[PDB]
């Protein structure tokens, strides 16, 4: 029950990984979803792969 502005995330140019699967990252603002789940953590670098 909240609008997701993915342009703020995608065009931030601060995130070191932008990996989208099944959905193009430029069309996240054009499709919409029943729910989205967010999991936020800190992990090492050789392991974000």
């Amino acid at each position, epitope marked *: 029950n909240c609008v997701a502005d993915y342009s703020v995330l995608y*065009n931030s*140019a601060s*995130f*070191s990984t*932008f990996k989208c699967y099944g959905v193009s990252p430029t069309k996240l603002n054009d499709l919409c979803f029943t729910n989205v789940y967010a999991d936020s953590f800190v992990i090492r670098g050789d392991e974000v792969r």
Partner: nanobody
Amino acid sequence: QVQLQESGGGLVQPGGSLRLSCAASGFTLDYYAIGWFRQAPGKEREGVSCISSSGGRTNYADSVKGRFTISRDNTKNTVYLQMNSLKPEDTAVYYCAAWEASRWYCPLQFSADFSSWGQGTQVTVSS
């Protein structure tokens, strides 16, 4: 199966020249923008040079103006970086990274996410 592979690293004399290669397998490198990045011993990974997908836009770090020349071959799926007048300050491991523009505007001067990375190659400048 997407791979980025650097080549051409080695040991050179200061004032000499060296030439690196970055080749892509499993995907077509022409649509991606490619940038060459190095980390010096005890330093953070700085942006050496970048080139657009079509090659019409380029950017270089001020330390390397007039010395390094970047270019690409979209038919051969490779991006090249020529180094001339090489200095001990440039001793570092060199990565090639491929990504897409995350901001409006043609130029590649800004930094952003880098989708794919190589394993890096070593160029040492010492004499």
